[PDB]
Write an enzyme that holds these catalytic residues in place. Structure first.
Site, short mmCIF file in Angstrom:
data_model
loop_
_atom_site.label_atom_id
_atom_site.label_comp_id
_atom_site.label_asym_id
_atom_site.label_seq_id
_atom_site.Cartn_x
_atom_site.Cartn_y
_atom_site.Cartn_z
N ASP A 472 0.83 -1.20 0.00
CA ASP A 472 0.00 0.00 0.00
C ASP A 472 0.86 1.26 0.00
O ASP A 472 0.64 2.18 -0.79
CB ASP A 472 -0.95 -0.01 1.21
CG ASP A 472 -0.21 -0.18 2.53
OD1 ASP A 472 0.87 -0.81 2.55
OD2 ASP A 472 -0.71 0.33 3.56
N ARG A 476 6.23 4.08 5.69
CA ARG A 476 5.95 4.06 7.11
C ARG A 476 6.03 2.63 7.66
O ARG A 476 6.50 1.70 6.99
CB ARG A 476 4.58 4.69 7.39
CG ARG A 476 3.40 3.93 6.81
CD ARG A 476 2.14 4.79 6.86
NE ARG A 476 0.95 4.05 6.44
CZ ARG A 476 -0.17 4.63 6.01
NH1 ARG A 476 -0.24 5.95 5.93
NH2 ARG A 476 -1.21 3.89 5.65
N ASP A 477 5.57 2.46 8.90
CA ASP A 477 5.64 1.18 9.59
C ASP A 477 4.51 0.25 9.14
O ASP A 477 3.82 -0.34 9.97
CB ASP A 477 5.57 1.40 11.11
CG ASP A 477 4.44 2.32 11.52
OD1 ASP A 477 3.74 2.86 10.64
OD2 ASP A 477 4.26 2.52 12.74
N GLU A 478 4.34 0.11 7.83
CA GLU A 478 3.31 -0.77 7.29
C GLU A 478 3.88 -1.56 6.12
O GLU A 478 4.48 -2.62 6.32
CB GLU A 478 2.09 0.04 6.85
CG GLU A 478 0.83 -0.80 6.65
CD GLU A 478 -0.44 0.03 6.71
OE1 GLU A 478 -1.54 -0.56 6.63
OE2 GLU A 478 -0.34 1.27 6.84
N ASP A 485 -5.83 -2.63 -2.31
CA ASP A 485 -4.99 -1.75 -3.12
C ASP A 485 -4.36 -2.50 -4.29
O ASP A 485 -4.19 -1.93 -5.37
CB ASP A 485 -3.90 -1.12 -2.25
CG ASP A 485 -4.46 -0.51 -0.98
OD1 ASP A 485 -5.46 -1.04 -0.45
OD2 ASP A 485 -3.90 0.51 -0.51
N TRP A 537 -11.85 -6.26 -0.80
CA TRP A 537 -10.44 -6.58 -0.64
C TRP A 537 -10.14 -8.00 -1.09
O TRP A 537 -9.25 -8.23 -1.92
CB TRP A 537 -10.02 -6.37 0.82
CG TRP A 537 -9.42 -5.02 1.10
CD1 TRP A 537 -8.19 -4.77 1.64
CD2 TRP A 537 -10.02 -3.74 0.88
NE1 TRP A 537 -7.99 -3.42 1.76
CE2 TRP A 537 -9.10 -2.76 1.30
CE3 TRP A 537 -11.26 -3.33 0.36
CZ2 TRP A 537 -9.37 -1.40 1.21
CZ3 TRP A 537 -11.52 -1.97 0.28
CH2 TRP A 537 -10.58 -1.02 0.70
N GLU A 745 -2.42 9.02 -0.47
CA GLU A 745 -3.40 8.13 0.12
C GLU A 745 -4.77 8.79 0.22
O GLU A 745 -5.80 8.12 0.05
CB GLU A 745 -2.93 7.68 1.51
CG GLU A 745 -3.93 6.83 2.28
CD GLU A 745 -3.34 6.26 3.55
OE1 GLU A 745 -2.26 6.74 3.98
OE2 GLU A 745 -3.94 5.33 4.13
N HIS A 760 0.86 6.28 -2.21
CA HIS A 760 -0.09 5.18 -2.31
C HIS A 760 -0.40 4.87 -3.77
O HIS A 760 -0.21 5.70 -4.66
CB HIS A 760 -1.38 5.51 -1.55
CG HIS A 760 -1.37 5.03 -0.13
ND1 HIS A 760 -0.36 5.33 0.75
CD2 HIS A 760 -2.26 4.27 0.56
CE1 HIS A 760 -0.62 4.78 1.92
NE2 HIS A 760 -1.77 4.13 1.83
#
Length: 883
Positions: A472, A476-478, A485, A537, A745, A760
């Site tokens: 995505d 960052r922390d993802e 997505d 999703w 995003e 994103h």
């Protein structure tokens, strides 16, 4: 002998030129065609597979010989002798053209099998016993998680060679990340290897060719382990290593070196390493000469046995992560003393390389990365959230040193460096673009420069989100593999990049995370366990698979995952006893001015994808010949439509003022609107776009993917173009006007913590609209068997071109619009047909196929009161609509 003078070219096994490490017992073979004449199409093929070069050059089928197969397909599944591990095979192919004229044999290609389904690996998993780690628990993790960051262990083993080698192979799976060295030289052309998967269910190992690296006497191998995703927070152990080194001599004898307790191990310069927080490299603790033959291998502790990760060790053929480009900074300033900030002019992914000159040892250099900036000139790390994204290098003092991180990556446009020995320049910093090295599949250019800038931002954003899994965000922390997505941007990536190898690996990841009841996780691999998944999703399983058949003609991937499709649809039927799936979590994610949908459309979006999943499954069932499954799903699909309309159709629009854009484009896309209501429902959509919103999107990630095609299909392409050409909120142009080099995003400009990321890909589905509508090249039949050349010259557009390299060859469309002449130049490869849709923009016209006039009056060619239809075969054609 014939007029078919060209043999098949660009022969691919597993969709790769000469693959090394084929573990599929029945790999996929493909080839492209070229002929002297036009209107040519393959009528027969024959592929020969042999076990030796002298053998294949005799036209004998040593391990496969299909003979003259009467089929127009150029993507075949292997059906020869059972392949064996570590063997190299050869294959050529002939093809018969439209007049049964036989073509010469292709150039001998090659595919080498890997270890082949864990065929007695002999090598065991090795590890250190101490394992020093640090437990970082920052304030504000996504779901309150912590980060256990282990160190970077190095593993060394020495072996001796005497008789001269014939070939050498190395089959390594270093979890979670690794770097391989042999006699001092780095081996792989890839980085951040292996790929991210559910290591408990499967571990992808990599095979390398280390023949010309073996040397004579003493030999040495080097493996350093990184954490990556194999961390305790996601349910894994500390880094471990398995590796076996096949060596074959000229006398047809074999020996190999496997991983065991005879291996030495130690800690080196790299301390903590994390994908979110960066890597620390202490040059003072650098064991000089650790991976070279003559080295004191003693004084090191021995490795111990590891508990295996639990997953089957496979070797998939897919594009790896590489350093795809090296960029140089464009601007540098200093907001605070000693702090120097670099700007690369583009939000990309990867790391940087620094050049230092210090002579003094022990000086710390801190490298921070960020997406945005502050007014005072300092970096804004808000979009990175809890991800530290800082790299630290401690100098050795050798007068000149270089450093790049090896076990991490960041998404950024700017770089802050504190502690540099003096003032740095634009040469001492080198940005490394790091992502899945996909090939370029298509070009696109427009007469509108704002569209070109939007198209430019999506290309960098998609590549930024390709790290062995579709992510995505990359900053960052993802960076998780969110299914929604990946589904909405799958059509764009296929148009821009070669993705069949990437999606086949990801389709396996979804298969490896499918629960027994058919459920799927919202992120795949399920490092974050979110079960069950949102229908918008979890639809990525059948959608991406259907895309692989639509744009590549690979029906085999439909049969390989068909049971998984039937199981997920079975689970969706459980959530819909009365046909309306009320369960939803995201829905139309991130509509303008919101995160959760403002129109209460989640249950409509969910039922939209329930009908979507059942309709395309019934389409897949009919393709494979399952008449019972076909009829069943077809019948069930009818149940939904009728239940969808009973609950949502309200006289003149859809609902649940009282109708949004999202509520109307979705039933109009799949054509769930009754025929007596389409004109009224479509008008509600147009009035909400033109009157209520002044040509602006009021849709989230789901409905934005369908809104442009809905207006184009119903003859309102001018409204869609006016939406794209907007430079104000909310639009893609507003992002560009606010300094976005990728896609945001959210529609709103947000530069704080929380869902405010600036790289994103979910909103990137508009790039598919540029190819299929603005340029005007779309798939007419799967595998590009038929191409539809339907340009849409709307607004003030003057020209547009899309050139694609598909599974059948080169596909091109060009058109120019002047006051008198509308030009059009198309290109159709061999074994494909073209369907030109010349738009009638003039009351009287000519239509010329080059210098030949082909339409003097009505009836010379087909027409449907809006277009002029021309049917052509392979070749290049120029059409001229004049007056």
């Amino acid at each position: 002998k014939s007029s078919n003078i060209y043999s098949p070219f660009d022969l691919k096994c597993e969709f790769t030129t000469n693959p090394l490490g084929v573990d599929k017992k029945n790999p996929i073979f493909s080839w492209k065609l070229r002929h002297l004449e036009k209107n040519e199409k393959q009528t027969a093929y024959q592929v020969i597979v042999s076990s030796s070069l002298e053998t294949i050059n005799d036209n004998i089928g040593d391990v496969w010989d299909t003979g003259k197969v009467l089929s127009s397909e150029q993507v075949i599944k292997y059906e020869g002798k059972e392949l064996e591990p570590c063997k190299v095979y050869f294959w050529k192919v002939r093809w018969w053209d439209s007049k049964d004229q036989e073509s010469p044999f292709s150039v001998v290609n090659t595919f080498e099998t890997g270890l082949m389904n864990e065929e007695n690996w002999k090598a065991k998993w090795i590890t250190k016993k101490e394992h020093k780690y640090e437990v970082y628990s920052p304030d504000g993790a996504p779901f309150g998680l912590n980060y256990t960051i282990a160190y970077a262990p190095m593993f060394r083993k020495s072996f001796s060679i005497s008789k001269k080698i014939k070939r050498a192979r190395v089959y390594i799976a270093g979890l979670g990340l690794y770097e391989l060295y042999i006699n001092g030289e780095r081996i792989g052309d890839r980085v951040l290897d292996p790929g991210q998967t559910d290591y408990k269910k499967r571990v992808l190992y990599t095979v390398y060719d280390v023949s010309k690296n073996i040397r004579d006497g003493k030999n040495a191998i080097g493996v350093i382990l990184g954490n990556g995703r194999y961390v305790k927070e996601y349910g894994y152990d500390f880094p471990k290593l398995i590796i076996q080194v096949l060596v074959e001599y000229e006398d047809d004898s074999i020996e190999w070196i496997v991983s065991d307790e005879s291996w030495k191990t130690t800690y080196g310069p790299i301390t903590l390493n994390s994908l979110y927080h960066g890597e620390i490299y202490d040059g003072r603790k650098e064991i000089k000469g650790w991976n070279l033959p003559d080295f004191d291998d003693s004084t090191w502790e021995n490795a111990i046995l590891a508990e295996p990760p639990g997953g089957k060790l496979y070797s998939e053929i897919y594009p790896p992560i590489r350093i795809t480009k090296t960029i140089k900074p464009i601007k540098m300033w200093s907001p605070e003393p000693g702090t120097y900030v670099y700007d690369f002019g583009q939000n990309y992914t990867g790391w940087i390389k620094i050049k230092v000159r210090t002579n003094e040892s022990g000086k710390e250099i801190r490298i921070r990365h960020a997406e945005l900036t502050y007014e005072d000139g300092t970096l804004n790390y808000s979009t990175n959230r809890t991800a530290l994204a800082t790299d630290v290098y401690i100098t050795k003092g050798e007068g000149y040193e270089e450093y790049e991180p090896r076990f991490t990556y960041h998404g950024f446009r700017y770089v802050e460096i504190l502690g540099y020995p003096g003032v740095p320049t634009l040469e001492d910093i080198e940005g490394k673009v790091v992502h899945t090295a996909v090939e370029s599949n298509g070009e696109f250019i427009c007469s509108n420069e704002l569209i070109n800038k939007i198209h430019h931002n999506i290309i960098w954003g998609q590549l930024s989100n390709l790290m062995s899994i579709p992510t995505d965000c990359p900053q960052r922390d993802e960076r998780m593999g969110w299914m929604g997505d990946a589904q909405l941007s799958a059509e764009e990536a296929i148009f821009n990049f070669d993705m069949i190898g990437f999606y086949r690996k990801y389709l396996n990841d979804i298969r490896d995370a499918q629960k027994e009841n058919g459920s799927l996780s919202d992120v795949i691999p399920p490092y974050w366990s979110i079960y069950p998944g949102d229908p918008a999703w979890s639809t990525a399983y059948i959608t991406i698979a259907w895309y692989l058949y639509q744009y590549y003609g690979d029906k085999y991937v439909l049969e390989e995952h068909y049971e998984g499709f039937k199981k997920y649809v079975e689970f969706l039927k459980k959530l819909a006893p009365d046909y309306i799936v009320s369960f939803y979590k995201y829905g139309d994610w991130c509509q303008p001015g919101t995160v959760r949908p403002k129109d209460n459309s989640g249950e409509l979006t969910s039922t939209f994808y329930f009908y979507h999943d059942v309709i395309t499954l019934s389409k897949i069932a009919k393709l494979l010949g399952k008449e019972a499954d076909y009829k069943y799903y077809s019948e069930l699909a009818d149940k939904i439509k009728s239940a969808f309309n009973k609950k949502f159709l309200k006289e003149k629009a859809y609902a649940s003022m009282f109708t949004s854009q999202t509520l109307n484009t979705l039933p109009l896309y799949l054509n769930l609107v009754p025929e007596d209501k389409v004109q009224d429902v479509l008008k509600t959509l147009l009035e909400d776009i033109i009157i209520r919103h002044d040509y602006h999107l009021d849709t989230g990630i789901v409905a934005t993917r369908y809104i442009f095609d809905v207006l184009t299909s119903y003859g309102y392409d001018e409204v869609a173009y006016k939406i794209v050409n907007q430079k104000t909120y909310p639009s893609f142009g507003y992002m560009i006007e606010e300094g976005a080099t990728t896609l945001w995003e959210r529609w709103e400009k947000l530069t704080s913590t929380g869902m405010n990321s600036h790289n994103h890909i979910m909103f990137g589905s508009v790039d598919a609209w540029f190819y299929r509508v603005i340029a005007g090249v779309r798939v007419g039949e799967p595998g590009w068997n038929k191409i539809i050349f339907e340009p849409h010259p709307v607004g003030d557009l003057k020209y547009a071109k899309a050139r694609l390299n598909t599974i059948k060859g080169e596909v091109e469309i060009n058109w120019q619009k002047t006051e008198n002449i509308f030009s059009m130049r198309i290109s159709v490869p061999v074994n494909s047909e073209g369907e030109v849709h010349v738009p009638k923009l003039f009351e009287r016209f000519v239509v010329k196929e080059g210098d030949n006039i082909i339409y003097e009056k009505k009836g010379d060619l087909e027409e449907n009161e809006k277009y002029i239809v021309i049917r052509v075969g392979s070749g290049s054609y120029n059409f001229y609509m004049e007056k």
